[PDB]
Amino acid sequence: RDAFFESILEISASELNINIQQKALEVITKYSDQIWDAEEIILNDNKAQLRPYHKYIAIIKSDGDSMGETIKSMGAYNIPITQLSKALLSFNIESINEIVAYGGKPIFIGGDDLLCFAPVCCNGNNVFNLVEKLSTCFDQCINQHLQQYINACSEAQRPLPSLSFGISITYHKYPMFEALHTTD
RNA sequence: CGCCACUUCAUGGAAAUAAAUCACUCACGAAUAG
Numbered sequence: 719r720d721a722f723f724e725s726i727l728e729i730s731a732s733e734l735n736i737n738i739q740q741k742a743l744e745v746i747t748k749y750s751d752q753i754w755d756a757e758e759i760i761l762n763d764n765k766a767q768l769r770p771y772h773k774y775i776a777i778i779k780s781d782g783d784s785m786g787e788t789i790k791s792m793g794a795y796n797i798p799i800t801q802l803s804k805a806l807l808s809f810n811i812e813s814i815n816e817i818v819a820y821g822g823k824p825i826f827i828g829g830d831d832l833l834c835f836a837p838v839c840c841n842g843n844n845v846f847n848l849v850e851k852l853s854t855c856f857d858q859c860i861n862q863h864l865q866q867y868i869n870a871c872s873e874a875q876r877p878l879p880s881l882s883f884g885i886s887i888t889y890h891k892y893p894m895f896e897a898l899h900t901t902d
Numbered sequence: 903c904g905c906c907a908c909u910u911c912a913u914g915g916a917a918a919u920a921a922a923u924c925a926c927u928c929a930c931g932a933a934u935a936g
């Protein structure tokens with residue numbers, strides 16, 4: 719209710735325009751194992767257009783780099799932290815928008831982290847394309863809101879705040895606990 | 903006009919030179935874990 723997508727395979731092959739949730743529910747009609755198996759064999763006999771990247775799952779984890787250091791650097795130049803809050807919130811909203819646009823799934827947070835469950839390739843768009851768009855969105859929000867900090871601390875020299883990225887691509891099997899720890 | 907032969911029996915040069923020296927495809931696939 720306060721929110722408004724499961725298994726591991728449905729968002730690995732969200733490109734065929736095929737609704738595995740509906741057919742899996744029809745077949746099954748405790749829960750997770752049976753529907754997991756149903757989705758598995760449904761896209762097993764969807765072999766006609768199934769490429770090897772349709773069975774691989776990409777986990778994307780990102781965190782903000784030196785946020786406290788950026789805060790301390792803005793403190794020297796008399797720059798409010800409200801601008802940083804603005805940039806982070808706008809980046810998070812745009813991140814959710816473009817992650818659902820790409821074909822993946824946002825899971826974790828709209829803070830300075832992001833854990834996304836995305837297919838390797840949907841509509842000819844990579845997970846690396848998704849990472850590039852996320853980085854560009856974060857840079858755009860930083861520049862748009864911290865413009866004062868941008869043209870005040872970057873002329874002489876400084877690295878601007880950025881986000882480091884962690885991507886893990888594994889089979890739909892090979893459970894996602896180990897994959898999550900590998901991503902971490 | 904008559905008569906009649908002896909000689910000489912491979913040397914020098916080139917003796918391999920360039921091109922290609924691996925190429926493409928497959929570099930794990932399923933099952934068992936979740």
Ligand SMILES: Nc1ncnc2c1ncn2[C@@H]1O[C@H](COP(=O)(O)OP(=O)(O)OP(=O)(O)O)[C@@H](O)[C@H]1O
Pocket residue numbers: 781782783784785786787799802803804806807829830
């Ligand atoms: N809306 C916001 N505005 C400003 N700062 C924020 C906001 N939300 C979170 N933060 C900051 O995020 C920080 C948490 O960042 P985190 O600890 O993940 O990374 P870091 O220590 O900056 O980076 P790294 O590990 O790369 O050195 C907190 O110190 C907090 O001040």
Ligand SMILES: [Mn+2]
Pocket residue numbers: 781782830831
């Ligand atoms: Mn963080």
